[PDB]
Design a protein around this ligand. Sequence first.
Ligand SMILES: Nc1c(C(=O)NCc2ccc(F)cc2F)c(=O)n(O)c2ncc(CCS(=O)(=O)c3ccccc3)cc12
Ligand SMILES: Nc1c(C(=O)NCc2ccc(F)cc2F)c(=O)n(O)c2ncc(CCS(=O)(=O)c3ccccc3)cc12
Ligand SMILES: [Mg+2]
Ligand SMILES: [Mg+2]
Ligand SMILES: [Mg+2]
Ligand SMILES: [Mg+2]
Ligand SMILES: [Mg+2]
Ligand SMILES: [Mg+2]
Ligand SMILES: [Zn+2]
Ligand SMILES: [Zn+2]
Lengths: 182, 182, 367, 367
Amino acid sequence: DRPQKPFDKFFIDYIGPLPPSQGYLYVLVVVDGMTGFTWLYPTKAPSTSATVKSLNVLTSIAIPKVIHSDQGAAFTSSTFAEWAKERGIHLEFSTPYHPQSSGKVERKNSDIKRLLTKLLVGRPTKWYDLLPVVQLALNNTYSPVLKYTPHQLLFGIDSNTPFANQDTLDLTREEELSLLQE
Amino acid sequence: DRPQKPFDKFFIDYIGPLPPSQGYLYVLVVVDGMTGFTWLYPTKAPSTSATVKSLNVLTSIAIPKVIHSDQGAAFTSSTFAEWAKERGIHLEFSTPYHPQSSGKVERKNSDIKRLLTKLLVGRPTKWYDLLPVVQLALNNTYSPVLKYTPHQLLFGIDSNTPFANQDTLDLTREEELSLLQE
Amino acid sequence: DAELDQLLQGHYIKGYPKQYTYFLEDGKVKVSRPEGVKIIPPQSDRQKIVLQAHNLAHTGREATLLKIANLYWWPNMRKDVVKQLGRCQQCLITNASNKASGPILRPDRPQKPFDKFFIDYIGPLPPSQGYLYVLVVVDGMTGFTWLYPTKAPSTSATVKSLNVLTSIAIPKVIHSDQGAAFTSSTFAEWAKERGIHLEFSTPYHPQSSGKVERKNSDIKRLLTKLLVGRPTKWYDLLPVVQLALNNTYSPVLKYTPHQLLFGIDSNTPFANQDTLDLTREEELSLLQEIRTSLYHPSTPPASSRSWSPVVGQLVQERVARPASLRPRWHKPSTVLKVLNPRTVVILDHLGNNRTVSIDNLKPTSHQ
Amino acid sequence: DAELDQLLQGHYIKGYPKQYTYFLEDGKVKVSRPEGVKIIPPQSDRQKIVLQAHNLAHTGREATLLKIANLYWWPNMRKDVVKQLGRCQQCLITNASNKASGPILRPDRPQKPFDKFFIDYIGPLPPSQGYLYVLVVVDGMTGFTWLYPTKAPSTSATVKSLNVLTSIAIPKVIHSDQGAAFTSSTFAEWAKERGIHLEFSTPYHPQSSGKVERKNSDIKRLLTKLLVGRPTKWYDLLPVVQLALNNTYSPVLKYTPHQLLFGIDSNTPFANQDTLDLTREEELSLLQEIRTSLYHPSTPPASSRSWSPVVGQLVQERVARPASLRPRWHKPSTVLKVLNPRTVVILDHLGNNRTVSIDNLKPTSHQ
DNA sequence: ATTGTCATGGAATTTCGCA
DNA sequence: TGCGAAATTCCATGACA
DNA sequence: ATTGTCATGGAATTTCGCA
DNA sequence: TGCGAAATTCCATGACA
Ligand SMILES: Nc1c(C(=O)NCc2ccc(F)cc2F)c(=O)n(O)c2ncc(CCS(=O)(=O)c3ccccc3)cc12
Ligand SMILES: Nc1c(C(=O)NCc2ccc(F)cc2F)c(=O)n(O)c2ncc(CCS(=O)(=O)c3ccccc3)cc12
Ligand SMILES: [Mg+2]
Ligand SMILES: [Mg+2]
Ligand SMILES: [Mg+2]
Ligand SMILES: [Mg+2]
Ligand SMILES: [Mg+2]
Ligand SMILES: [Mg+2]
Ligand SMILES: [Zn+2]
Ligand SMILES: [Zn+2]
């Protein structure tokens, strides 16, 4: 069998609804399966339109062979099926109520949820401007298994933003107070 | 003594007043002494201003060593004396009531008077537009003495407008009828 | 299928080299070449494959081939690629040429004064006494120049000025570019009345009026210097510039334009006195010898990758004032006649006969 | 008088050759040279004579001399002529140079992706969805390009676009010209917050941004082809052009910008499959070898009459947007430091220190 | 049915002044 | 029949929208 | 304190297929 | 160890306002 490579399989999913941030409510998460590299796109809804708009930006940089997702409405629509067929993208779906991807991707989506939650508290309407630094943090995070960051596996070089001071990712006691109040 | 050359001596004089032709009443006549080449400039008056204006056009093409004239007011003014001194032009005057120049120039000024009179009759207000063809006729007229036209002596070549059909220059009997009527 | 069927079982087809093993896999004919395993498509599919590869970014020969070679191999691929590049209309009319024009002609200096005038307009300039333009008239033989200020580059201002000029002498020929003032029927009428032949440059090529264009440079350069530290009141300086340049030596000629026209300096500063003891006829005889013996340049060497036009060749005229994101070249046209190595007649994109400079032509690529 | 008095009676003065007879006539010292009888003016009159001859048409060396030689002769005339040409301010700032710039540098290709971005704006273009401009961002090592449509070439539109871009990675250096969008303090603030060094071209020299300028040509050329026979609706085509050019082979490199950035093609047409059996680490090892071994051009030969700057030399900066009939050059300034053979620091005409390209400099003539 | 041109100042080459 | 310096000629460069 | 670049297609050069 | 043709490399040309 052939070794796993970047652009073989993008894993997509929606996070939301979130509090409004400059008119945006959701985040389309795209994770490359091999490298673990993450792209994040803010959208106003979990619709096919918003997915096609966000993925058109991504697919003007690089096109995946396969897109994997759960059976969410936006991904199972025939409009998204025609969009994928035009670009030669095979669509792949997990069984309903059994979302399965891969250990590296599961742990990556876990990091994204917790990293967002830690920065949502205190400034819950300002996450649109923080999406760039969130991606840089995720993509320059060390991988225990592969022993390389997503940035290193995708580009084959060290980064100019190494996040050496690893964030705790858990919430402090004071951040639980303002989180439980809201 | 040195042989006579073009630009050694311009002979200037005014002809007029003539009937109005596009606001102009006089003609400043400039004849080069050596070649017999003629320039004609229409003016609104026999003034120093009109002389200086017309001769500034000529002296941007070629500057004479000497300008000769009768003791007319425009030529004896101190403004015209200063104009000539700025350009290094020596002014030369004939004695009052004894206008003398040279046989070639006298015969040239005779031709100009008679050639104008012959074309004035019939169309006395249209001599402004005819000044170009009058100059070409005068400057491509054969010289009995030197056996070359003014054009040939000035430029050293044949002309593209040879006036082979020599004009009679005298007035016909019908042209005397319309001339004596006016 | 038919050609590729004999290939699989082992028979020889011309173009396909024998030393490689041609096999079938996943319903497709393949071959194990040193670069890797490539698919051999049938003859009927190849034009579509080349077109698909080319149209990705409308790439030229090698960039298109490198795409096709990632998946496919067949005999003489670049021949099929070049075939499609010559049929792609978008590439022919958008791409640049990579062949320079042939070396410039240096036409003979007119033999006599007033054989050929070169006229052109300078402007618009800063307003001076209400005047914005300058009519420049350069005698081809002598370089002797006349300057006239005008309010517009119009036929009426041109006729006004040339009537004053032609008081001194009529020229045989007047050369000009295809500007509105010179191409009007009113100007052609004015020229025919006086026996003057109107000669016109090829369109969009000021090199052809280069005699007067080069004089425009000296006129502007001297005006600039005289106006340093002053407001640009140039109307009064035109008589001064005209006289100054007409009496300026050309180092290569050793003569001023005034001297070439008259054979003797007038009463200007630093006037030459070498012919003071000669008669005028002796002076005019020396002038005729000077006029014939002037330096004249020759055609320079061609650049290493130049082209010269041939009758029947496909060529493309440059678009004059091309809009944004629009092609810089017209559709291919054919060379009817070669007037000289630098000038040709073509069967225009509209259908007309058009005389053009090869500087505004490229040879259509891929034949 | 004193020097010329001894000359008349027959004594020898240095500079004046003995074999000619120097006599007096009309109160002036003269000499019978082969060209003719010329006046020898005294030392005190000569500077005025050269100035009078020069100022007729502000002529250079030989044209000025030919005027003076009609009347006068004295020892080493051209030395006095060249002396005045170097003191004529109008000629120094108006005349053109006749020395070419030295040969261009070909700076090293950045070693890694995201070491140096080159950014620039295209526009204005025909309105498309209300957008008039395109921000072009070119990675120096790979050539991989990002395109962003904007309504103006502004700092706010630049920051918006680069925040989206830098989501993928932060660059070490961003190179740009001195356009208003990039020179603002708001942009410098944005770059310092992210650890990005702002590098700027020398003014009025787009060659220095040549990496992105050349990419602008390909962007416009492909847009032109795709819009043939259509209205210029280019907003929707920018994603297509971006993807197409990023996956286009450079014939000299044998690689696409995508391949130089990622080391493996994505799911695009005609994708390369040569590294299908390698692991990603084996693939990234081959990529690092490919990045270091790319072709790089060298400095071309200098033209036969080029100049290179020297510390302390008098040079003149080109006027940026010169008005009509105004000089094309600034007053002479001095070369403080030579940063490289093509770039220098000068003591500006205002008094400031200014870093400029030698393409916008001429060496002041006549020392 | 039309076509590049030529001032400029360092450098290269020739001529001058003297022997 | 030869040297050093001055004078002359050569010609690449650039700008005429 | 900074620096030209590179797609393009004929031509020149090298490699291929076969002997 | 050498030929004819195909494949590859060379590189002048021009345009990015
Ligand atoms: N653009 C014109 C130039 C010009 O660009 N000169 C720069 C130049 C560049 C190189 C060179 F070697 C010499 C040179 F002077 C020009 O000089 N003139 O006189 C023009 N006269 C009229 C028009 C109007 C449109 S046209 O269709 O009548 C037309 C277009 C082009 C040329 C002539 C006539 C334009 C121009
Ligand atoms: N004129 C600009 C060009 C241009 O002329 N390109 C043509 C070009 C020519 C030759 C070459 F080799 C490549 C090349 F692209 C340009 O490309 N850019 O991006 C500009 N960007 C901004 C401004 C605004 C005034 S500025 O003072 O900020 C300034 C002036 C000049 C340059 C840069 C910045 C002008 C330009
Ligand atoms: Mg979901
Ligand atoms: Mg009188
Ligand atoms: Mg014109
Ligand atoms: Mg012009
Ligand atoms: Mg710019
Ligand atoms: Mg630019
Ligand atoms: Zn094409
Ligand atoms: Zn000057």
